[PDB]
Nucleic acid binder design. Structure first.
Lengths: 126, 380, 208, 191, 128
RNA sequence: CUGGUUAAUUCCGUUAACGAACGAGACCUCAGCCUGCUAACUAGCUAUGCGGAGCCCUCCGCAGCUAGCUUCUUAGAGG
């Protein structure tokens, strides 16, 4: 039927989306979105494309992300929905494109080399 | 079949033997194929009834492949054109409007090999990755191209360089590939039914960058490769690679059959394009820009395609133009020229429609144009 | 971890028995309950002696020592496949002059001067000061190519060491060699691997 | 329309009066602005206009740090956000506009580097190239708010609002304006 | 209607005994082969050979699956002493490759054992 | 020596030099190595059930190596 899954990735933690299009309700760990991430600004980073577009009822997004902190969760969640739409519609190519997509980042924590008190700020003496 | 220039003799006994054997087999073959050549098309063509106006212009301009557009092939319905680009993306387009029906993120770079299936169902392309992955086309609204029962059909040692359908689905693959070998395959199972393996002149020892399927019964197929030969392989029987021409100085980086089936245009990377007649078995025509003044950035190069009538050869070159030729007459009918107003770029592919009404050109500048002719004669 | 232990415990035991020892280097593979122990050596003779008592008593020890299972064992003789790439004899021969002396300087050049002659392309021999029983002065000399470090991981350098207890004073050491590689052909030196072609006229020729 | 930015405030209405400073104050990004937090490496090329900005990103970001110990950007984003609503309820004007008023007032025109040359140490006064203005200013506004919070029963979200409103009004009560016109006074004099 | 308790019985075949016959119907099957080496380059090549053998025998067993990683990384300022920087990670992988057959014949066991390609590869025939 | 360039006698252009080694780079390493896949399943998703829950509509749990593929996992290739 309808279920298009293009799997992004960008930071630790894994988001599989199988999306059947209806009313704008959002799930994560199969539990309601605002309430799971109650009290967060970074939660509304996600919410950005299921308002702003002029499509509200056209995406019921079913999301599961598993394993790491509160912060990480938003950036991945978002990417997927855009990428799926671009494949079908070439006119909503300017949906994917102008609303930001694609960073691995690749700057998630770095090597610890010896001597470092943290890893890279070598001792106060010697 | 191609006279060779006087070269200074060596006084070694052992070589003369070399000259002996080699020259004994090739001259004995040369006296049978050669005789059939009554005139040359150009000579005969002098007192021809004339051609009508040529009036192609870019009717519509299309865009959407991310990288450099490598390759195109038109669908038999006259309405789809595909196309594949280095980014790995494959797009099916309807050209007039230019709407995009489908897009699949396919896989490799070097995916320069998109073809349309005779049914219209499918595409194949592939390239770096060493496979061809198949894909059915559907009306479904959702459009996840990637899952709908695709399939890695093929495994080569090296990089898929060329693929083409025959007139049917059942023989969905005839390949010549970077792995060197050329191979016939059975579609569903993916087994290699037979392998054809021959030589340096002669077979292809090195990478097949193209092959093209003969037009009739499609009994044979001609391939082109780096070993500088145009070699037709007898697909139907014992598969002694059957009849060969090695006229070229340089890669025959391309090879396309006439709709008549009588000739093929050898477009090569060596600074000429040449036409070779498969039936008579000799070089019919030479396309070359002989004056020192008439030089472009690169002399003419990679790819060739035929009109439906066969009168015109529209060709892409690295230099960024098209020179349009009258095949029989030997004249240039015309120059087509496109885009930038300073600085070059490759035009890598150019492909005829199935009805013959129009052609699509893809270029490294990241744009596409479709040029068309309508009406018998000049418009209106 | 426990599978790991056995490699480490076994590796030292095979190294110590196989120390001074006037023979040539000693792999061991220990299959279920059996030890292959492969000696690459001329004086295969003293260790075997046929049937007797000899061959079993050295072995038996390893089992009862740390390892495994109600049996016997086996022993095979070999040659050696141009000596460099590993041994003992190579190491010992320079000690077997560094017994009685001989111009010390001569041995250095001389042991290097052989081996190069059988190809080797570089060889580096290195000797501890206290020559003439004065203060230390370690010596080099190295010819030809040779690297343990910088070039790629796969240059295939024989490198060892040894020791020399003279009367009055130790004379260390560390011989190094880089040649062809373990007999079957499979040369890959020092990245890049170049090669083009010459010509090309052409009508028969290429891959390359 | 449905403006976001904490889901309460617009930003394309926010006017930057200083034309020179305006061209370095990004209130608009590639599709339009937002404030939601991240980072994005564009480095530090010179002469020209040379980076994209957000004030709101710098300001929270000054807060987590200055001053001092212990806090986090999640806490810092919260304090900016609390300070912004406290600012709006005491000005009845967009708190993004009020921080722009505070930054222009707190961003000195000229500054005073200390150069040893020959047998002595001069300060001849220097440029303060506009990203440095924006910053000195934010910092002083944050350091003031930090300092006020350390020594008063006043939340710092309030103290940031308190310092920001005093700076965005030219009031020498503010640490940031008072240090700005201290810096301009030495830079103007030491010629 | 309702009342569902689900097992396997296609018939036959499951992972706990992969049923096959004869020899009084073979009631033997569960073998696990865990092959542990230092170096991958050698391992893979042996590992592939097992897969092939199963395919030949009668009933096809699955190929190599190579799972999770064992590191002991020990870094010593080697000594001087005093040595306290420019210290050392020489870091050591040991890798674990676990290859099943679907049916563990008498015939499988015996062919697989006799000619067994391990040089540095340590391979344990196992066991209920 | 010089001229230029660069973390780099790094490379080029000159030169009474023409080479050549050894360091560097290359290399094996890990970070995102991903990605469509080829490979298998720990596991994930998804399917189907069934114990219930709101009042198969919506939702949690586990069931069978039961079905298949995959971001996870994993090795390779390419990229």
């Amino acid at each position: 039927a309808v279920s298009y899954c293009k799997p992004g990735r960008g930071l630790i933690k894994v988001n599989g989306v199988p999306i059947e299009l209806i009313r704008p309700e959002m799930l994560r760990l199969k539990a309601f979105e605002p309430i799971l991430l109650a009290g967060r600004s970074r939660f509304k980073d996600i919410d950005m494309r299921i308002r702003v577009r002029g499509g509200g009822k056209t995406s019921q997004i079913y999301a599961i992300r598993q394993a790491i902190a509160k912060a990480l969760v938003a950036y991945y969640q978002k990417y997927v929905d855009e990428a799926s739409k671009k494949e079908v519609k070439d006119i909503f190519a300017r949906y994917d494109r102008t609303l930001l997509v694609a960073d691995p980042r690749r700057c998630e924590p770095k090597k610890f080399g010896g001597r470092g008190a943290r890893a890279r700020f070598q001792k106060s003496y010697r | 079949m191609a006279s060779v220039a006087e070269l200074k003799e060596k006084h070694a006994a052992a070589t003369a033997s070399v000259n002996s054997l080699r020259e004994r087999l090739r001259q004995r073959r040369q006296t049978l194929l050669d005789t059939d050549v009554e005139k040359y098309s150009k000579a005969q063509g002098r007192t021809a009834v004339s051609f009508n106006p040529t009036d192609l212009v870019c009717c519509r301009t299309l865009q959407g492949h991310s990288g450099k557009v490598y390759s195109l092939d038109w669908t038999p319905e006259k309405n789809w054109i595909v196309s594949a680009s280095q980014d790995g993306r494959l797009i099916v387009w309807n050209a007039l409007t230019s709407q995009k029906t489908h897009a699949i993120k396919l896989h490799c770079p070097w995916v320069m090999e998109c073809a349309f299936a005779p049914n219209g169902q499918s595409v194949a392309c592939g390239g770096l990755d060493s496979a061809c992955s198949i894909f059915n086309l559907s009306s479904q609204a959702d459009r996840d191209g990637n899952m709908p029962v695709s399939r890695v059909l093929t495994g080569h040692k090296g990089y898929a360089s060329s693929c083409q359908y025959v007139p049917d689905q059942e023989t969905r693959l005839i390949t010549g590939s970077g792995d060197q070998t050329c191979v016939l395959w059975d579609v569903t199972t993916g087994q290699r039914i037979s392998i054809f393996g021959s030589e340096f002149p002669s077979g292809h020892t090195a990478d097949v960058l193209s092959l093209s399927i003969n037009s009739l019964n499609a009994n044979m197929f001609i391939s082109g490769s780096c070993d500088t030969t145009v070699r037709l392989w007898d697909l139907r029987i014992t598969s002694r690679a059957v009849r060969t021409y090695h006229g070229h100085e340089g890669d025959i980086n391309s090879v396309k059959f006439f709709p008549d089936g009588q000739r093929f245009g050898t477009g090569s990377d060596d600074g000429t394009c040449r036409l070779f007649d498969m039936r008579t078995g000799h070089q019919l025509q030479v396309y070359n820009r002989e004056p020192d003044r008439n030089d472009n950035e690169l002399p003419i190069v990679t790819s060739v395609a035929f009109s439906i009538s066969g009168r015109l050869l529209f060709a892409g070159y690295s230099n960024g133009d098209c020179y349009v030729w009258d095949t029989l007459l030997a004249e240039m009918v015309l120059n087509l020229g496109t885009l930038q107003n300073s600085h070059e770029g490759r035009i890598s592919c150019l492909g005829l429609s199935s009805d013959g009404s129009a052609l699509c050109t893809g270029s490294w500048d990241k744009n596409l144009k479709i040029w068309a002719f309508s009406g018998h004669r000049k418009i209106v | 971890v426990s599978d790991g232990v056995f490699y480490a415990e076994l590796n030292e035991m095979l190294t110590r028995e196989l120390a001074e020892d006037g023979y040539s280097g000693v792999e061991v593979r220990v299959t279920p309950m059996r030890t292959e122990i492969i000696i690459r050596a001329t004086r295969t003779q003293n260790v075997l002696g046929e049937k007797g008592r000899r061959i079993r008593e050295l072995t038996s020890v390893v089992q009862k020592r740390f390892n495994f299972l109600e049996n016997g064992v086996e022993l095979y003789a070999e040659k050696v496949v141009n000596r460099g790439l590993c041994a003992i004899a190579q190491a010992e021969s320079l000690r077997y002059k560094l017994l009685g002396g001989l111009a010390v300087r001569r041995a250095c050049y001389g042991v290097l001067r052989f081996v190069m002659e059988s190809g080797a392309k570089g060889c580096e021999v290195i000797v501890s000061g206290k020559l003439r029983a004065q203060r230390a002065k370690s010596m080099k000399f190295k010819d030809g190519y040779m690297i343990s470090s910088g070039q790629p991981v796969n240059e295939y350098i024989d490198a060892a060491v040894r020791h020399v207890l003279l009367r009055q004073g130790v004379l260390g050491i560390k011989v190094k060699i880089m040649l062809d590689w373990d007999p079957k052909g499979k040369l890959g030196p020092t990245t890049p691997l170049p090669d083009l072609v010459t010509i090309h006229p052409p009508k028969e020729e290429n891959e390359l | 329309q449905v403006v976001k930015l904490f889901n309460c405030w617009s930003f394309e209405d926010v006017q930057v009066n200083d034309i020179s400073l305006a061209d370095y104050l990004a209130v608009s990004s590639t599709k339009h602005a937002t404030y939601l937090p991240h980072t994005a490496g564009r480095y530090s090329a010179k002469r020209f206009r040379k980076a994209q900005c957000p004030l709101v990103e710098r300001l929270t970001n000054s807060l987590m740090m200055h001053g001092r110990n212990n806090g986090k950007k999640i806490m810092a984003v919260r304090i900016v956000k609390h300070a912004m609503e406290i600012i709006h309820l005491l000005t009845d004007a967009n708190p993004i506009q009020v921080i722009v008023d505070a930054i222009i007032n707190s961003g000195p025109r000229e500054d005073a580097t200390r150069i040893g040359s020959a047998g002595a140490v001069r300060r001849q006064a220097v440029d303060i190239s506009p990203l440095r203005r924006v910053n000195q200013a934010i910092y002083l506004l944050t350091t003031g708010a930090r300092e006020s919070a350390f020594r008063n029963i006043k939340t710092i979200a309030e103290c940031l609002a308190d310092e920001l409103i005093n700076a965005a009004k030219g009031s020498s009560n503010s640490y940031a304006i008072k240090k700005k016109d201290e810096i301009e006074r030495v830079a103007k004099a030491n010629r | 209607m309702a009342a569902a308790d689900v097992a396997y019985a296609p018939p036959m075949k499951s992972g706990k005994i992969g049923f096959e016959s004869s020899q009084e119907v073979q009631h033997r099957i569960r073998i696990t082969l865990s092959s542990k080496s230092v170096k991958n380059l050698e391992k893979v090549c042996g590992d592939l050979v097992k897969g092939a053998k199963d395919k030949s025998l009668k009933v096809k067993g699955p190929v190599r699956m190579p799972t999770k990683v064992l590191h002991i990384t020990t870094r010593k300022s080697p000594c001087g002493e005093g040595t306290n920087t420019w210290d050392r990670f020489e870091m050591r992988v040991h890798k674990r490759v676990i290859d099943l057959v679907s049916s563990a014949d008498v015939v499988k066991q015996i062919t697989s054992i006799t000619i067994e390609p391990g040089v540095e590869v340590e391979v344990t025939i196992s066991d209920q």
